[PDB]
Amino acid sequence: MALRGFCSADGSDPLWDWNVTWNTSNPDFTKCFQNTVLVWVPCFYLWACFPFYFLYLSRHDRGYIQMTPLNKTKTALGFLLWIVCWADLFYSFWERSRGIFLAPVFLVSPTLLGITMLLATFLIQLERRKGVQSSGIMLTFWLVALVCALAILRSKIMTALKEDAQVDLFRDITFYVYFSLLLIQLVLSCFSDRSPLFSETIHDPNPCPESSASFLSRITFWWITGLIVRGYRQPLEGSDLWSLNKEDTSEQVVPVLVKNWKKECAKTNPSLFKVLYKTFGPYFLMSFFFKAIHDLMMFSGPQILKLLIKFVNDTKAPDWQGYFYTVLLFVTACLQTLVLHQYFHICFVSGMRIKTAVIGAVYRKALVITNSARKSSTVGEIVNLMSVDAQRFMDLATYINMIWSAPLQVILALYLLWLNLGPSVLAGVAVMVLMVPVSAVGTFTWVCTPFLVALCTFAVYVTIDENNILDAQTAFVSLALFNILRFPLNILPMVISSIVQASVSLKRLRIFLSHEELEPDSIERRPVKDGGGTNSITVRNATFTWARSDPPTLNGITFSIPEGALVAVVGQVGCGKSSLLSALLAEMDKVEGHVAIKGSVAYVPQQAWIQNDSLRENILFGCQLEEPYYRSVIQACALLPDLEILPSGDRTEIGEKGVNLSGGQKQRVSLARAVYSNADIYLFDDPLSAVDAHVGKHIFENVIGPKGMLKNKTRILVTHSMSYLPQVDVIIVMSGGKISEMGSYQELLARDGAFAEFLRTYASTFISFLSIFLFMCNHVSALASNYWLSLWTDDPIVNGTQEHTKVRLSVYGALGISQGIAVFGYSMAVSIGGILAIPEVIKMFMGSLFNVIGACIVILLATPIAAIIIPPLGLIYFFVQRFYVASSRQLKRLESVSRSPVYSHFNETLLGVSVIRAFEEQERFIHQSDLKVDENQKAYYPSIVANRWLAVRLECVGNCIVLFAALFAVISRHSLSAGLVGLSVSYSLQVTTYLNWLVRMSSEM
Amino acid sequence: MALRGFCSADGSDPLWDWNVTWNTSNPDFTKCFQNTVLVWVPCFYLWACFPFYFLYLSRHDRGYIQMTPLNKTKTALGFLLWIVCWADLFYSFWERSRGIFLAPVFLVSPTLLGITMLLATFLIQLERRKGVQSSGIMLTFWLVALVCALAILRSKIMTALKEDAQVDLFRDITFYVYFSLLLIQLVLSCFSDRSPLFSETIHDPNPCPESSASFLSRITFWWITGLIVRGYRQPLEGSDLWSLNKEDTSEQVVPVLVKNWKKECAKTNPSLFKVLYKTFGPYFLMSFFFKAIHDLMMFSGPQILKLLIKFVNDTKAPDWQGYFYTVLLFVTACLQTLVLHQYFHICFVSGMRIKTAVIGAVYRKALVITNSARKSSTVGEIVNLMSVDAQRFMDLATYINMIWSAPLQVILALYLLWLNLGPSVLAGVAVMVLMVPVSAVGTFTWVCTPFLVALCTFAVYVTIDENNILDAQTAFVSLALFNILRFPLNILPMVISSIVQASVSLKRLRIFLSHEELEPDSIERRPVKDGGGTNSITVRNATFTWARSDPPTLNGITFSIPEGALVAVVGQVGCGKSSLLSALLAEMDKVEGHVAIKGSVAYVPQQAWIQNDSLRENILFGCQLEEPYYRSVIQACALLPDLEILPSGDRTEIGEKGVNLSGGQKQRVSLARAVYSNADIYLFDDPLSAVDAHVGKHIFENVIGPKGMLKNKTRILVTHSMSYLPQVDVIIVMSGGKISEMGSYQELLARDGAFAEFLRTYASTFISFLSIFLFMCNHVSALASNYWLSLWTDDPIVNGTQEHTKVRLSVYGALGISQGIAVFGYSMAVSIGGILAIPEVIKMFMGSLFNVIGACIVILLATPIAAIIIPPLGLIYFFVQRFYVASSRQLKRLESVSRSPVYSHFNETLLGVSVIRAFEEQERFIHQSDLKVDENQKAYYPSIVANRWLAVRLECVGNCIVLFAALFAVISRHSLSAGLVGLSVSYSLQVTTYLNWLVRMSSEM
Ligand SMILES: CC(C)CCC[C@@H](C)[C@H]1CC[C@H]2[C@@H]3CC=C4C[C@@H](OC(=O)CCC(=O)O)CC[C@]4(C)[C@H]3CC[C@]12C
């Protein structure tokens, strides 16, 4: 109790005295309210965020915009605001020093205002020091200070010119200067400054404008318009889309996730959710503070509706009060929009981010992991993992924040119902429980559902007791609250289902990513580790097996050979020569054994794989061009006859998505790639399996034979031939995975040992008018029913009831049952017409058109002057709708056609992981699979941006029609009953919802 | 009288009544006025504008913008606007059909509106088909129609909600739709449309934005804003300026003038003034219909001010009339500014066109006429004529309208003042005839002249009458009218001097252009018409004379020679060798004879002409250096030693603006040009007179002699040398106007006649502070005088006369004497300061700044609230002045730089007309001059454009401060005297004028 003696010595300034600010015809805050609250509100608002912005901006340095004249003038005007707000204090000090005792308010509040102005100037300077041009806080701070100064200035102007008033002419001039500088600063701070000195734009010529746009453009999503209008005349395709903003790209997002996941693995199992929350979480804190605000505004709307309806029925309420409602509502609605679509977008963006991160991780954990530990089918269990269990993490972004908001709303709505209908909630909750369990007939019952719930609730309310009256207030507030509650009751189902399927997908992603089979960490040293050596093959105590749970198959393997002696391996059918070489690939699990290899080596499988591209690209595999290598790489392989028959020679799309080849052709192209790889020794797996006798002999004598070009290279090959063995000096013979004999062919032949036994054993060497009439009847019946409700809620209150209750309910039920009969009839008619000779699209298009038309006709009926705003809004609506519909199909086709390449590339990489890992080049494929997904995301992002643009435009149109349907019903309150104004005001929210549904569903088909 | 019965049968609805529209406190036009005049005004406007616009656009086709959505929506809105008017007509017909009589006003006013809307739609279609971006008529028509519909709508909304008003709710909704559409079309007509399909844009990358700019942009000069902001940081130079726009280019403007002058000359000698009118007249008429409107608004202003002052004085008048007056004043001032500064641009553009056309015409006329008919010097009368005349025909563009303007202004001001005062203004003119005859004291008296004239007028008015009171109306009216009239009085002089000087210049230009002497029409046979013949020169009975009255000097010239024959012409000094050469080049008049020649002739001028350029550029004369013949002629003419000693070889700057060379070097260069010319007939006139004997003999043996490579061509010689005479095949002896003898050297020697005689006879082998204090004293004295006059004009009237006045006049005179003493003292102080150690610039900077500060505090201490408006006008004005000065000084320096080159090129061409015509090349230099003039005017145009930009931005600010001074002094009319309000309103126009003076003069520093 100090404010009375704080502001004036005696005390005659009761703060918020309702006898001056509310009840009069000239509302005005008390002098002390103006001096204290209207000054401290903006200062406290700015001081609250200064911590947060100093914490956030010091981590996001972007540029050094140096000395733009806007910065100079803003700093100068901030200093001028300081000097005036300090001169006010100095004049107060001079007055108190040599004059009348002065209240402490005049000696305290200007000090705080001056301090706030200094902080604003310093924040502008620091905001310039960092690379942010258009402030998102300076605009709002100046706006709030300007609103408060506007209130104070209105009070001062009204107080001035009453009659010869004796006023202090120092706190007038100074305040006018302060308000003028406030307006100047607010207008000035709406412009974007220069670009940062060293911006990210160095080579990209088409960057997305979101990284550099004014605050209003970001709020209203105005930077998409550039490609929407441009997307109307010339069809959109490919390169017209922008480039990503360097923070959604895969090469920037993925490393954070992979390092966090590997740190979590080291710390240990708990799922990656526990890290998935801590990597993309801090971007959700802005998706939770932007849902509570919109949620509060959604409920705060109908309270303003109730206040307006109560005021209308007050014939003695002061006029201006009405306006004070009809503005506030508008503003509130607008804020809700400018918050709701600032949440969705953020959420949506984060969801898209999730995708790339997972796509970055699974790929990077697929081509360098799980050596033979991959028992899930390559098709339908790994690429399908990517597709399904990563496309499910963009919906969970949208459906996660509802798990707390959707229930809350419900109960809060129910709470308000209790506060509205009181004991009638006992029947209202019963009717809602009846409606909870509640095809064309089904859809039309859903259409009539608002009528059904209204009829049931009103009937039970009027029949439970004779002590309750159905005035406009309770009826229309209940209608609005039911319309609000409808959406969460529809959203509560399938949200739990989405959470469940996302949990299943999370389990699958964990069970894949938690393989952790880092088998090729290091099992042997670098093959060609020393540049100089003598022995090619050396081995001792070699033990190798397919997996951990298999008995050993290789024991007592100990032999060696220098460089220069032709060596080949001979094994019986099923003896394990293929598995032996597979173990020799250094791609298996080793218990013990010492093996030495020397020389650069590449790989050639016995099951050749073809990358889906041209023959030339398959041969290149990274190199630019070396002409002699190509001219000498085809004659040796004898690919001239094979290249000539090809439809396009060395240009056709070989392999899959092209002309098929024989197995020998795949073998030949693999050998050509291998000999292009430029190694010193090579690995081959019987490449001449299907080659003809003459062709095989020619190929062997061309290169592989002693006269071949690669005779300078020691020979490492496998085969099961017989005529190819005698030319080999020493034959490596495996007997049950163990060496048989070592020595030259002459020595073993003279020995007459195992080889002699092998040779001896083998010895191989009327309705359209009806539909229109029924539609018109149904819609005019609905409009007449609403008009009848408006008339009924205006009945006089005599004898504790209305003028007559039974007849009103009887006729209400009568035309409701008539409407039900009509809807059943035209449902049957339209179903028969569709079956006898897509129909749903036309039905809902006509329904929504007629609903919007009926709402407009109701608005016109209430106040004819409303016809002022029906044309200009409608045109605007059209000039949005068309555009979006003409620029959302293309942005959907691009995104849908760009999705397949990433999955096809992942399947390609998964099929031939052995070959790419063998060639010691696994980084180009990562770049390719990152670029493809980056292109897909670059195509996908403008789709959601345009969706937000369209939604904001439609919401603004709906808010404008709300405001201009309340204005004309407040101006003419003296000739319109409460029912008319209540119905007209309640219909505009449904106008907004109908417009949004019509745009989203009807024309998009 | 017929209109009264038109409104209604009973005449209960008049067309006007002061008791319903002006007397009450709720003004509203009567029913008939709203239904007839407000509905016919825009329609009459458009129907009157239609024929002139159609005729103007019939000859200004620019493109075929086909089907832009803007055109489609505008056409749809036009059709839907016509349909509502036809609906009104049909409703009136249906109502009158059954049983109702409704008067014919409802059958005519909606009848013609449909026609007007259909005409608007057709005009939009035609404008689209004729390639106009933003309409200049449609926007104004929509604005006028919207104003009328706004008045009608306000009347309708006020009438409807009065008390149980039974209004037919069919015309109301129709009119609401009509108003809505009008608003939509007005806001849509501010959008620029697509560019025309085909235009001049095929190579120009930097076009002027004037050709493609919205109507609300060319009115306010908004594009120069782009070039002006860029000029603040980076300097403006060279290619930064915009290229011209096909209308100011010299290539297309000169042909019209030259063709029309040729036609005028062929008619007859009337001056080119007559053809100047018909060539550059049609564009100047728009500068006539604009000056009158500004002259009318400038006087409509003071009457509005007087009405506002009278309303402020009266207390029983309603409170809305003052707002009407203060809005009309602002609208009138804004329209006056726009009209005046759109007239000035037209005037200056016409002046620029005159200059370029005259320059081009003079250049084209100069270089191929007046052969040997020039008695004046080549310098000081042609190039001086060019420069001075062309630069004197731009100021006449601005000064020509003053001769018709002055009367309208002076007689109208005299009329208004006489209607105000009468005999008092008779004494007024008796006092103005004191300043009619009308140095620091002189400047100060000039500054104080309005105060002195007001003091004298008021003193005489109150002394000679003593029965008329100094009111508030007549006084401030007199001040405003005198301020208006001051400028034309000073501007009328120097106009007649400008006209006299321009007449002198026009006469001298006419006499230069009429010096048409095309002597070389045709005299001899065509030299190179064919390409065959054996006789080189065939001349018989040739007579040539220098002048018309001079006796003939050549007679009996009859000789001939075949091709490839050596001829030498030998004659004594004064025999006529120079005249023979002049006649042989075919540039002198012939009376009789037959002369024919075949083949291209080598021109050997002993006089040297060199243009300041690179040496090689002079060498080529426009050709290339592909052929190696240049090296051959360098070697043959022994030019290698000449080239070696050059500072940079063939790159050193030869000719003027460079190094100097001897006569022999220039002769050798000219001989090189002659051998580059590729001639067939070779003539020689002692070109080696200044060359050394050995060098001359070597060059003679090189090229001139029979041993030269050009020996296969005819050679004819003339000189006084004796060494080369024995080696010539044939000799012509020229003496006494006749050929003495004809024959070969052997036969002439055998004759022993003239040749023998020639051989025998002719053969050889404290101050700062004092000034500040005095300035402050003078300004506070002026402020005290202003306060005293404000008090004096508010004195009560008792017993016929007013309060004590003689003491007020005495103290006013004492204050004037003190002000004179102060100005004398500080003029002495400033003179002492200047003589002890631009000063006028600083003096009047002080004066303007102090006066604007004093006026700002004067408006401050009349309405304190007005302090809200000082910051956001001072900041805007300061920024505009800074931008203008910074971006205008640079491109004024550009014009200073780019003025000399055109005159230098003209002198260069004039001094070498002989050579440039001898070798038949007179087209490249025309293009060079056109390019130079085009560059100069391209750099000069933005100067006037930016001047208009600054002026508009300053006049708009002045109008805004005038409005806010005339508004804040009406809201509180009760507590202000008439004198204070009149002073505050009257001082704002002087504030605007002082602002313009300050910016221009005291910022061009
Ligand atoms: C109490 C009475 C005297 C009325 C108050 C009026 C003046 C004290 C103030 C009001 C607004 C002020 C102006 C507000 C903004 C500016 C911009 C400012 O521009 C700069 O200096 C920025 C560029 C730079 O610093 O180079 C120059 C001073 C000026 C004109 C100020 C000059 C002083 C003004 C006219």
Side-chain angles (χ1 to χ4, degrees), chain A residues 69 72-73 76-77 80 84 173-174 177 181 184, chain B residues 232 857 860 867 870-872 874-875 878-879:
Chain A
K72 272 190 215 148
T73 190
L77 294 176
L80 206 58
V84 296
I173 295 333
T174 288
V177 160
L181 295 193
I184 271 169
Chain B
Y232 197 32
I857 35 176
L860 271 195
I870 280 293
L875 174 94
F878 161 81
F879 260 29

Side-chain angles (χ1 to χ4, degrees), chain A residues 102-178:
Chain A
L102 264 153
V105 160
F106 315 122
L107 207 61
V108 162
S109 197
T111 313
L112 195 78
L113 211 64
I115 281 299
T116 304
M117 285 311 110
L118 260 63
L119 179 151
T121 291
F122 160 84
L123 210 63
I124 273 178
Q125 222 44 66
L126 171 140
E127 192 146 70
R128 179 221 79 171
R129 262 176 264 150
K130 277 76 217 181
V132 74
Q133 331 158 264
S134 56
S135 311
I137 292 313
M138 277 311 148
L139 177 64
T140 291
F141 165 58
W142 294 130
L143 183 131
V144 155
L146 177 126
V147 154
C148 295
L150 255 189
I152 291 181
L153 171 143
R154 144 162 177 160
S155 152
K156 221 159 300 308
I157 281 166
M158 261 174 47
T159 280
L161 55 100
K162 334 178 301 316
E163 45 66 65
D164 52 59
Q166 209 272 343
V167 282
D168 195 4
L169 257 283
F170 198 94
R171 263 174 216 75
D172 266 22
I173 295 333
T174 288
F175 178 77
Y176 297 139
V177 160
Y178 164 92

Side-chain angles (χ1 to χ4, degrees), chain B residues 143-157:
Chain B
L143 202 143
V144 153
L146 190 98
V147 152
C148 293
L150 185 62
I152 295 195
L153 171 134
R154 177 186 170 285
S155 195
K156 234 156 188 155
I157 171 184

Side-chain angles (χ1 to χ4, degrees), chain B residues 841-858:
Chain B
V841 165
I842 305 167
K843 163 72 224 175
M844 199 40 188
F845 192 108
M846 182 305 278
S848 289
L849 184 52
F850 267 32
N851 210 232
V852 80
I853 284 189
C856 284
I857 35 176
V858 152

